[PDB]
Amino acid sequence: SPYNLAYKYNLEYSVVFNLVLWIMTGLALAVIITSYNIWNMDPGYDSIIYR
Amino acid sequence: NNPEYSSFFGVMGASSAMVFSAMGAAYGTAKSGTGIAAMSVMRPELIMKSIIPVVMAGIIAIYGLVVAVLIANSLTDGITLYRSFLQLGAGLSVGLSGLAAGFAIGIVGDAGVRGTAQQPRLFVGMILILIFAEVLGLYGLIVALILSTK
Amino acid sequence: NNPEYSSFFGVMGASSAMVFSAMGAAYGTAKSGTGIAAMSVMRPELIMKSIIPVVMAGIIAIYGLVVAVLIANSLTDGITLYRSFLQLGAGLSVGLSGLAAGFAIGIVGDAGVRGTAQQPRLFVGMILILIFAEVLGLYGLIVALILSTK
Amino acid sequence: NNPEYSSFFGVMGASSAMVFSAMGAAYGTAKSGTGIAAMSVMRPELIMKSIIPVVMAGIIAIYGLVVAVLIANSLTDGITLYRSFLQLGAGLSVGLSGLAAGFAIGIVGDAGVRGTAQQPRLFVGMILILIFAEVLGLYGLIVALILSTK
Amino acid sequence: NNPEYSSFFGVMGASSAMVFSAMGAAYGTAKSGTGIAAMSVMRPELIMKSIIPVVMAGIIAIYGLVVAVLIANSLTDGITLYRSFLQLGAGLSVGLSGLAAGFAIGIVGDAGVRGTAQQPRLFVGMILILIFAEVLGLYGLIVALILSTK
Amino acid sequence: NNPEYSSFFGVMGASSAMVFSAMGAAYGTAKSGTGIAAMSVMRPELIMKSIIPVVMAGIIAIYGLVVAVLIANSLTDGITLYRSFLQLGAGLSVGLSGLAAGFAIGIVGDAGVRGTAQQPRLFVGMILILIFAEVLGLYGLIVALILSTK
Amino acid sequence: NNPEYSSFFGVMGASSAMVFSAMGAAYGTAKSGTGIAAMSVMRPELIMKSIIPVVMAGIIAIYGLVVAVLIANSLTDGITLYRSFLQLGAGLSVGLSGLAAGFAIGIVGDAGVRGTAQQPRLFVGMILILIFAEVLGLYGLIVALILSTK
Amino acid sequence: NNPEYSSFFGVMGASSAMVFSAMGAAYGTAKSGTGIAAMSVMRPELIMKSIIPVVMAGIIAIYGLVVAVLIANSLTDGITLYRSFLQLGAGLSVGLSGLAAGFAIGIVGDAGVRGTAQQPRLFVGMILILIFAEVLGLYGLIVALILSTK
Amino acid sequence: NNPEYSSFFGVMGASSAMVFSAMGAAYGTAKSGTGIAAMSVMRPELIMKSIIPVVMAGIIAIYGLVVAVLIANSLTDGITLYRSFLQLGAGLSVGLSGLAAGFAIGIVGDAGVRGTAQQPRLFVGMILILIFAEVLGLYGLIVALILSTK
Amino acid sequence: NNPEYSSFFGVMGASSAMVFSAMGAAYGTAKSGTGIAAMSVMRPELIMKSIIPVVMAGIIAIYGLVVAVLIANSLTDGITLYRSFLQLGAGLSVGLSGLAAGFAIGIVGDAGVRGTAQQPRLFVGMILILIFAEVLGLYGLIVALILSTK
Amino acid sequence: IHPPVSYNDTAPRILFWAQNFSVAYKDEWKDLTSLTFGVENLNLTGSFWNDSFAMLSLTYEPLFGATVTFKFILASRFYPVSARYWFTMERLEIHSNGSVAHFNVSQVTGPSIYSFHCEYVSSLSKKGSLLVTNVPSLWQMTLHNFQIQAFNVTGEQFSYASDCAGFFSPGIWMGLLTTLFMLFIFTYGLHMILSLKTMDRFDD
Amino acid sequence: TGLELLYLGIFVAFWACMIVVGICYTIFDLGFRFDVAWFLTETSPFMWSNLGIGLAISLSVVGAAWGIYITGSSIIGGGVKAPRIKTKNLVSIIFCEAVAIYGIIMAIVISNMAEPFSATDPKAIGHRNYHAGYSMFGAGLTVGLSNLFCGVCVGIVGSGAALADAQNPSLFVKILIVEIFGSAIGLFGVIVAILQTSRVKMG
């Protein structure tokens, strides 16, 4: 741009940044932990593995 | 007029209403489904009774869809941040309460169905426990309908 | 004058009130329902007597629902951060306390019901101990009702 | 008018729609396939029935593909930020719902096919449970279509 | 004058007081009730002596309740950061102390109930150890009352 | 005009298209190889037939390579962020979908060979199960080709 | 003029090419060494055939070196940020593709060697499996040259 | 002219060149020594031939020393930043390649010694296998020299 | 001229020189002392010889001390930032290389004591392996002296 | 004058000097007293010899305390950043080196007393190896005096 | 695109730009933007610069029916702490028909090699209240997309701009330290709770 | 295993992200931002202080609480076959509570020091107030963590003593000395925290 004007961040961009980060973190952790749980859960069908 | 990023929170709400309810319903369906598979070998007749856990896990996924669609139909470019954050809260409220419901359904449906394999009289007790699990999705839904109709 | 984004903490309150109470209720229900199903194979006559831990778990989710609805009806566009934080603290308080009560209900329900299968006299003690568990939901609810009305 | 650093979210939608659906189809496939392989040793005639969970895993991948390609056809240079987030939310919503469905299909497909080795009647219950698992992917697609066209 | 964020810390205080005390008391209750369940099979008469750690854990929840209510009644919009951080400190102080005291009560109950069941002479010894565990809870209460009135 | 770093996201696409596809093909090869190695001791007649999952692991690596090269040949200093992000999305879309296919191929490639050595009839059904794995890479590739172009 | 930080990403390229390829070659060698050593006792004559997976793990480190050299020989203080990201891409591409190839080569070059002493006919099969491993490093090299030269 | 932090990446290079190489050599030594100690119980004579992995671990720390010294002797306050990133790349490229080498030297230098105890003929094989581990450190050194002297 | 913050790095160097060396010498001591104690019951006469690993771990603590003292005596109220970085690098480079030698002396000392107890011929060879551990600390000292004095 | 926050690093120095030393001395005392108690049941006569590791652990707490006192009586609001960092470094050096010395004291103070329970000749050896632990606390102290008095 | 205000002495020494510049007196607002930026006729009477200090004087004839003048006031200082020449706009002054008013700007600061920018510099809380006032005022000011440099200028273009408060804030940091601390306690508490267990057997 | 791995993942990711940021703001020359100065100055001294006070209590209470049940569990379990244990070996619990006492002592002393500034500019807040808030945090942290470790050690060793008594009564009197060496660590935490507190004033 002709005068090297700034990137034009908003006021409270730090609020927005933290909201996006911590919400995306909390969303991702809840997905990841639930995914890890259902991935590693035990179906316990041993009565068939023996036969 | 209203700020940029407006829809992002409400969009995460719509997704969350679906995804966490689907994760709940998936765990519910998965865990209880394995108990049905195990039980069926001992009890040929009880298969069509023992599905009710899995039906209610489907209901949790429907509760997620109900809110997710209601949020999605309510989104716009010019949306006030107020409704966008309310829609996030809504989608988490149904989604994670439905997760809680579906997790409970999975366990109680598995244990109930394996119990009915040994003693079929347990079925009435299992249904009552399942109602007390399923209603967690209804409570999440109630709050989410408020936080999306307001 | 009030800042932008201000509803976020309050609706996180509303969602958390419901969600964490539903998770507490889910764990409570899951472990209780497991212990009930295992017990009931030996003792079908105790089925209806032994549902109470699951009822208390439903009550924990209802305490979350109460606070969640009271926040959801008091949220407004451009709300003060003061009410928004009060609603956050209220919803966190009941929600996270409802987790605690849920674990106590689940553990005491599971152990209590399977001990009761061997010895009926445990039932009286179990119920009293479950009152000492369930009341944590009321304590969370009390603080949450106070906070959300300041 | 529209800022850059903005088409990124819809692109992440397109990726995520495919990727989490592929993960769903993968866990679905890997679990069920191990079940089929183990089962087949004693019951080869059940293979052509027992493949169905692996076919259902394909449907999740197709749902993800459809949304991903739909988003890809909907992307543009200088896209309106509102639509970019909607496409993110759609792609996550189908993708992670397809993951949930994937896990459910994999677990119930495995346990179902294994149990079917001892109980041919379980095939009926298994198909019902597979419908109740797979429909989570369909629900994810439904909201994702809505969001992709809002 | 005072920042619009100022009241947020005292809110988190009131939350933490109730939550971390509920968590500690829940764990204390869960352990103790599990011990009662096991003990009662051999010593069904001993329940109403052995319940002491359960009520003591409930009293740790009450210690957090007292502080939480006191903070909650002490909150306002125009609050100084000074009063807000005093209230936060009170909340954390009773809260983590309530975890600790409730945890010691639980473990000591789980032991002491079983020890008494095999050896009646231990009953008073258990109660003494539990009184010390409760006094740790008093120290968390006492600081929290001091800071909340400062 | 574009940022100096505009080509970064595009090259990270090209990298991801190769890297995650290689990880996919690696896991797919590793599990398949151990399976072949374990069973070939008992059934050396099967060795040439047993290779197929490894071949499909190669196909996933090739799908990665194709997108990586298409991105890399499309990439330049002067690239607009729209095309750069699209190439990131493409590179992830194949790359992680190929990894999903690589997890799938690997598990089925082990279990399938184990069954086939005990029961040669599995060899037909095994290949079908593997086709339903490998197609995940192809779906990721389809999206990635689209996003790599426009 | 070009940003003075730009050479950082270029050296991260050369390093990653070497480092990750060495990590692959290490794990390929380590697993193969355990295999060859554990195998040797029963069939000592097999060592001169059984070294070959180690040579392939060596080749992975060579592919890293070829890229790392070509990057390092191309750097300059004035380097355009575009070329520097290409070099990071090339470095990660070969390096992590080599790591992937080394995971395959390790797992195969263990299990295949331990199979081969039980059944010598496996040896040609192990070679064929390993071709489909070592080629991942080559795909990494192919992309890495295509990036770093353009 | 040059940035104040410019030398930081140079000295972290020199440190990294040593540290990771020492970690590599340490692990290589530790593993090999443990094996040697264990084998010597029934093998008082093999000890002097068995130390060979330990020495091959030692040279990795020396390769680190070469680069670490080379970098250190070419540091100055006025360093051009580009020289510092070259030096960082060198120090990591030897440091971590030596780490990888040390892992391979360790696992080989255990298993190979054990196998040689069981069967003296393995010795030559173990020599060759160990070369393909130690050469990683050499490749680390080659690029680290090219970088530091560019 | 120089930044008042700038002595922070050199001080972290002086600290690191001791601390990580101490962590090393401690671990090496701790492991060896456990071994000596578990050996002594059978072979008390070996103590006066089998102590050597602890002495070598002591040498690592000395290598730390040397550099820590050297850095500290070289600090000044307005230190040149370049000199402060040199000291940081010295500090890590001895400190962590001493950690690595501490690990190595630890593992070798513990295993090599058991080996000596079961075959006394080992002790003369163990010393060589222990020197090959301990010298890593010395190479870290060489570089650390070079950096501090450069 | 100096910057306002300047004293914070020195405050963290006095705390680190004490806290990490407390962690060390506590762990040392715990492992030692555990080893004493377990020995003492078999060999009641040996406590007055076997107490020494506990005393040495206390000496680590003294090494923390002395530095912490020296820092605490040196601290002021007027402190220059340079002396504030020196106090930090000292506190970490004694505190963490003390922790390392406490770890070694704890490991040997256990294993050595257990050995001595079986074989009294160990006592001289155990003291020698324990001196080479406690002295790391002294080396920590030496660096901490040198820094904190600069 | 509006051209910056520039103060020149052999070369440009101060550069100033905004998307909007506006003021009020007795809370009656006026727009100065088109009366200021790109206006070659703009009166800069009493504008001054030195390597230590800058006074960007801006003067106008019609505002509130009278001659009105603004001073934007800045300093450069070496700080031994960081060892850089920092800068700040510490204050604004308004010189009226017969009186002076001022604003304690404060947050406008950076290293002298970088310009500073903000979405708003204003007295209004909806726009951050950066114009701190220790007294009641009839005046108000707002700059939208404010950008300034007053030291180390080169050419009629800004150097790179430091943000005001883009990535984090004081209330956020204090909030996080508290939050992360209680989340650590919650993890500890929840870890013990997830560690609860029940029997699988009972006595005879 | 799994629940630790989830936490470990967050822990490693946190430090990995700080390394990425530390490099990023350095290489892009943005390293004038994240100067620790503004963090350690725009934070309120009252935040640091109140965390300090609450740490002093609560960490002491945690150390004491572990202290209590670790010995108590052994008192009970040995007590089944040796009921004599309970009355005398309870002194370990008394020392665990003494670690809590050390907490509440130091916390109450710290709690007298803080007073309002009537200021928000860092220069109007001034060095004494910052130095106090930090010193108070340091003191409360010092006693808190020192007591945390002290109490756990006392609980461990006191459990050992109780299980020694279960085999021979005479062992208790002899072994009990180690509880002093444990308890002393908490006192040392107090001593340092007093000295860190000793120069403070606020307002």
Curated annotation (Swiss-Prot), chain A:
Q: Which residues lie on this side of the membrane: Cytoplasmic?
A: 34-51
> Where would you find the membrane-spanning parts of this chain?
13-33
This protein is called Renin receptor cytoplasmic fragment
Q: Which gene encodes it?
A: Atp6ap2
From Swiss-Prot, chains B, C, D, E, F, G, H, I, J:
Q: Which organism is it from?
A: Rattus norvegicus (Rat)
Which tissues express it? Expressed in brain (at protein level).
| Upper taxonomic lineage | Eukaryota, Metazoa, Chordata, Craniata, Vertebrata
> What is the name of this protein?
V-type proton ATPase 16 kDa proteolipid subunit c
Q: How does it assemble?
A: V-ATPase is a heteromultimeric enzyme made up of two complexes: the ATP-hydrolytic V1 complex and the proton translocation V0 complex. The V1 complex consists of three catalytic AB heterodimers that form a heterohexamer, three peripheral stalks each consisting of EG heterodimers, one central rotor including subunits D and F, and the regulatory subunits C and H. The proton translocation complex V0 consists of the proton transport subunit a, a ring of proteolipid subunits c9c'', rotary subunit d, subunits e and f, and the accessory subunits ATP6AP1/Ac45 and ATP6AP2/PRR.
Major localisation: membrane
Instruction: Spell out which residues lie on the membrane's Cytoplasmic side.
Output: 29-50, 110-126
Protein's gene? Atp6v0c
Query: How does it sit in the bilayer?
Result: Multi-pass membrane protein
> A GO biological process this protein is involved in?
positive regulation of ERK1 and ERK2 cascade
Q: Which NCBIfam families match?
A: V_ATP_synt_C (TIGR01100)
- InterPro entries listed in its UniProt record: ATPase_proteolipid_c-like_dom, ATPase_proteolipid_csu, ATPase_proteolipid_su_C_euk, F/V-ATP_Csub_sf
Q: What are the recorded GO MF terms, alphabetically?
A: proton-transporting ATPase activity, rotational mechanism; ubiquitin protein ligase binding
Swiss-Prot record, chain K:
The cellular component terms of Gene Ontology attached to this UniProt record, alphabetical and capped at eight, are: clathrin-coated vesicle membrane; endoplasmic reticulum membrane; endoplasmic reticulum-Golgi intermediate compartment membrane; endosome membrane; membrane; proton-transporting V-type ATPase complex; synaptic vesicle membrane
Alphabetized GO MF terms: ATPase activator activity; small GTPase binding; transporter activator activity
- Keyword terms of this UniProt record: Cytoplasmic vesicle, Endoplasmic reticulum, Glycoprotein, Hydrogen ion transport, Ion transport, Membrane, Signal, Synapse, Transmembrane, Transmembrane helix, Transport
PTM note: N-glycosylated.
State any GO BP term from the record. endosome to plasma membrane protein transport
| Compartment list | Endoplasmic reticulum membrane; Endoplasmic reticulum-Golgi intermediate compartment membrane; Cytoplasmic vesicle, Secretory vesicle, Synaptic vesicle membrane; Cytoplasmic vesicle, Clathrin-coated vesicle membrane
Q: Is-annotated flag, keyword Cell inner membrane? A: no
Source superkingdom? Eukaryota
Q: Which residues cross the membrane?
A: 166-186
Q: Which residues lie on this side of the membrane: Cytoplasmic?
A: 187-204
Q: Where are glycans found on this sequence? A: N8, N20, N43, N50, N97, N104, N152
Tissue localization of expression is: Expressed in brain (at protein level).
Assembly and partners are described as: Accessory component of the multisubunit proton-transporting vacuolar (V)-ATPase protein pump. Interacts (via N-terminus) with ATP6AP2 (via N-terminus). Interacts with RNASEK. Interacts with TMEM106B (via C-terminus).
Q: Could you say which protein family the record assigns here?
A: Belongs to the vacuolar ATPase subunit S1 family.
- What's this protein's function? Accessory subunit of the proton-transporting vacuolar (V)-ATPase protein pump, which is required for luminal acidification of secretory vesicles. Guides the V-type ATPase into specialized subcellular compartments, such as neuroendocrine regulated secretory vesicles or the ruffled border of the osteoclast, thereby regulating its activity. Involved in membrane trafficking and Ca(2+)-dependent membrane fusion. May play a role in the assembly of the V-type ATPase complex.
What name goes with this protein?
V-type proton ATPase subunit S1
The shown chain, on whole-protein numbering, covers 248 to 451 of 463
